[PDB]
């Protein structure tokens, strides 16, 4: 039973956890309902953790950094979980848990958010959530974590190559990675350039202006200082009452997103609407039909076949 | 009749236009339906214009710049309309039309977008759309124009004071205003700093990297060069086939936004949902209820009272 599973999860049973996550990842209407009851039971045991999101372009070094950070943390007495929303030395360790990405963005987002509750209830005190680069995936992850970390390249004038614009402003901390080999001095200059842009984007910020750090994830340099900064972010926000405020706001926002997706899905997933979408859009693109009149036809058609 | 009004608008009757806009601004269900028929008739006569959005903080100088730009353009044979989404020398002129902002953002957005169609049909070839600073108002205006212009302050390290973060990335052109009095050299340095950040945000952009210009709207300096740059934006995008692409994409996006707002409004505007919102949100904030379970209760309650 749900009541049994909850007891085994919070008591720390290593076999219960993956079964609980499996229940949460299921989109069968029977499973969703018990999942919701299980999460209700475990919600009071959650929240005692720091949730950190980590993003950056393919090949910037996210997996290398996460592995090195995960070991740094395990050696300091933390229990560390890694999730991906789309590391062999780490996976070995009993105080780590690593899980691959679970359909749509809404769906992977929901499954990830619910899995966080389970991990925290199971005693994990650090949750690292990696993007797979792009969807609206960066925003989704930023909205479920306490501290969002952007990794960039350590090259003057080229740090943000390949990043979706607007992602810089999501970051609580920015890191220039691969500050090694022929790019030690270059990395400092590249960090100073990003710092200059961050001062322009946050010119009179008084609580937290995102720091720009350098790192060599492959040589294991800069991970400790990155975590020191993640802790300082939490301390600063907590002293201002904003750490809890951010979480409460994210939960209310997610509630309304669930309401939105439920009501919009009826229209979007409607086979007949899917059939006529192309032609209705073509008519709009060609100025043969107004957006308002095309919207009305979409709604009428959904309603006739719902 | 709608058929009569359309003939008078496209034939250039100055009395028909404000009546047509009045019909469009009405949210009475009878008016909305004729408005839609009128827009359908005039849609083929629209599109022959450059739509420019203009944003920046209160007091940066938007109204001063728009007045000076509007006169620059009128003197060059254009017919210029000014709309606001929330100038005495300009209002005097027969080849200008100025209209104050029309409920919600969705509502003002819809009325503004429809009014654009009417103005273009009436022979206006430049449409300037001013924000009133913030809502999600900047995004709304950027999504209905061809060229989005951000005005900022001409002070080194303080150009973006008061701007919602993420707004910089909406801009097709950035202008440092008030490059006058004691800030002539400072303005050049402030422009160079923004240019440096723009290079970092757009490091390998090949089609259009947003230029940063200086201006003194109050002394009438820099308006001509601002318009020269707006024309160059259109020429560059047109040569790449992106000018028409942007418009078609905005229209399809607006269509789906209308569908979204129709379906979400049923829930949001429901009196009973409004009544229980506070307590449901409090329960979510306190960890007494899951987002998914709160969403379900919101949907059930809407459905019971719909
Ligand atoms: N020079 C250098 N290479 C790195 C660093 N971190 C990762 N790499 C290399 O970059 C490649 C991609 O790294 P990976 O961690 O898989 O990047 P990911 O795609 O972001 O997860 C691999 O060859 C890594 O060895 C670093 O700090 N310096
Ligand atoms: N020094 C200087 N003042 C300006 C300039 N443009 C506008 N102003 C002044 O700034 C104040 C606000 O200008 P206004 O155009 O109303 O700004 P708005 O709120 O953005 O529409 C007024 O006192 C203007 O005279 C400029 O280029 N230089």
């Amino acid at each position: 039973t749900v009541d049994g599973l909850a007891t085994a999860v919070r008591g720390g049973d290593r076999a219960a956890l993956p079964r609980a996550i499996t229940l949460v990842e299921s989109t069968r209407p029977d499973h969703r309902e018990q999942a919701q009851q299980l999460l209700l039971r475990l919600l009071p045991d959650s929240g005692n953790a720091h949730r950190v999101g980590i993003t950056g372009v393919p090949g910037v070094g996210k997996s290398t950094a996460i592995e090195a950070l995960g070991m740094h943390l395990i050696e300091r007495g933390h229990r560390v979980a890694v999730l991906a929303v789309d590391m062999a030395r780490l996976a070995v360790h009993p105080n780590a848990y690593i899980r691959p990405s679970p359909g749509t963005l809404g769906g992977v987002t929901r499954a990830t958010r619910e899995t966080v509750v389970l991990l925290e209830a199971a005693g994990f005190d650090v949750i690292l959530i990696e993007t797979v680069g792009v969807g609206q995936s960066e925003v989704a992850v930023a909205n479920m974590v306490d501290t969002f970390v952007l990794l960039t390249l350590a090259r003057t004038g080229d740090q943000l190559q390949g990043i979706k614009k607007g992602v810089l402003e999501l970051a609580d901390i920015v890191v220039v990675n691969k500050a090694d080999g022929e790019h030690h001095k270059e990395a400092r200059l590249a960090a100073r350039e990003l710092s200059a842009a961050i001062r322009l984007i946050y010119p009179r910020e008084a609580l937290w202006r995102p720091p720009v750090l350098t790192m060599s994830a492959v040589e294991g340099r800069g991970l400790a200082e990155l975590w020191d900064t993640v802790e300082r972010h939490r301390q600063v926000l907590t002293g201002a009452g904003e750490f809890d405020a951010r979480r409460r706001d994210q939960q209310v926002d997610w509630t309304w997103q669930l309401v939105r997706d439920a009501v919009l899905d009826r229209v979007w997933s409607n086979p007949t609407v899917r059939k006529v979408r192309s032609e209705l859009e073509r008519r709009v693109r060609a100025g043969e039909l107004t957006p308002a009149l095309a919207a009305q036809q979409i709604l009428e058609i959904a309603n006739l076949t719902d």
Side-chain angles (χ1 to χ4, degrees), chain A residues 1-13 15-18 20-27 29-31 33-40 42-85 87-88 90-98 100-131 133-163 165-181 183-184 186-187 189-191 193-265 267-273 276-296 298-306:
Chain A
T1 61
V2 172
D3 220 78
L5 208 56
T7 287
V9 170
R10 80 164 75 97
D13 178 342
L17 184 59
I21 296 167
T22 295
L23 188 77
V24 145
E25 287 179 349
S26 186
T27 49
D30 43 333
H31 291 139
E33 148 73 37
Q34 33 212 339
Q36 283 325 297
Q37 298 310 125
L38 172 70
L39 290 157
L40 200 60
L42 292 173
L43 209 44
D45 309 300
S46 73
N48 249 264
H50 195 158
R51 309 151 183 170
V52 178
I54 294 156
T55 195
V57 296
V60 75
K62 300 177 293 306
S63 75
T64 301
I66 286 168
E67 178 155 68
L69 177 61
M71 292 306 294
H72 172 80
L73 292 176
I74 282 161
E75 295 177 352
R76 287 161 176 71
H78 301 284
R79 300 192 72 215
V80 177
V82 181
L83 307 168
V85 174
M87 301 175 201
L90 194 56
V92 157
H93 207 286
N95 295 342
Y97 188 81
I98 307 175
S101 189
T104 57
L105 185 72
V108 299
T109 298
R110 177 209 41 85
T112 301
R113 284 182 166 265
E114 300 183 342
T115 304
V116 169
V117 172
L118 302 184
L119 296 165
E120 292 174 347
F124 283 88
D125 71 312
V126 171
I127 311 293
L128 309 180
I129 307 179
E130 194 190 3
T131 59
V134 328
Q136 278 308 111
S137 186
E138 304 93 320
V139 169
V141 175
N143 286 343
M144 75 181 73
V145 298
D146 302 309
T147 303
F148 194 66
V149 178
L150 171 64
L151 311 186
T152 75
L153 298 165
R155 291 307 303 273
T156 41
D158 248 337
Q159 302 97 321
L160 306 184
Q161 276 173 260
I163 295 298
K165 79 183 161 182
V167 172
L168 184 62
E169 290 70 18
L170 300 180
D172 300 306
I173 300 171
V174 182
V175 175
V176 304
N177 194 39
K178 316 194 162 183
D180 52 55
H183 309 113
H184 273 111
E186 187 162 345
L189 296 173
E193 284 181 347
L194 279 166
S195 293
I198 291 293
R199 294 199 292 280
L200 299 191
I201 291 157
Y202 298 86
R204 300 183 175 204
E205 171 65 33
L207 187 57
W208 185 266
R209 180 193 273 163
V212 180
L213 307 176
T214 71
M215 165 180 288
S216 181
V218 75
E219 304 179 347
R221 298 173 188 281
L223 284 308
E225 289 72 20
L226 167 63
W227 196 254
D228 288 346
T229 302
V230 172
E231 293 185 343
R232 194 200 326 146
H233 185 238
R234 189 180 169 132
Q235 294 165 341
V236 166
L237 271 58
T238 299
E242 300 278 353
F243 183 89
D244 286 353
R246 173 161 175 178
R247 284 179 170 196
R248 296 179 180 113
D249 291 357
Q250 291 176 336
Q251 287 282 92
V252 169
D253 291 351
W254 180 233
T255 303
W256 290 100
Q257 191 60 37
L258 289 171
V259 169
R260 279 185 208 103
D261 294 338
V263 171
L264 305 174
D265 180 74
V267 178
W268 264 120
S269 295
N270 182 299
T272 306
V273 168
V276 304
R277 170 177 179 197
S278 277
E279 179 59 14
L280 280 175
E281 289 184 2
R282 192 202 58 80
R283 284 171 188 195
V284 168
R285 289 179 186 270
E288 292 171 22
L289 195 60
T290 61
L293 283 172
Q296 193 184 322
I298 291 159
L299 296 153
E300 286 171 353
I301 282 152
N303 182 69
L304 273 173
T305 60
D306 209 338

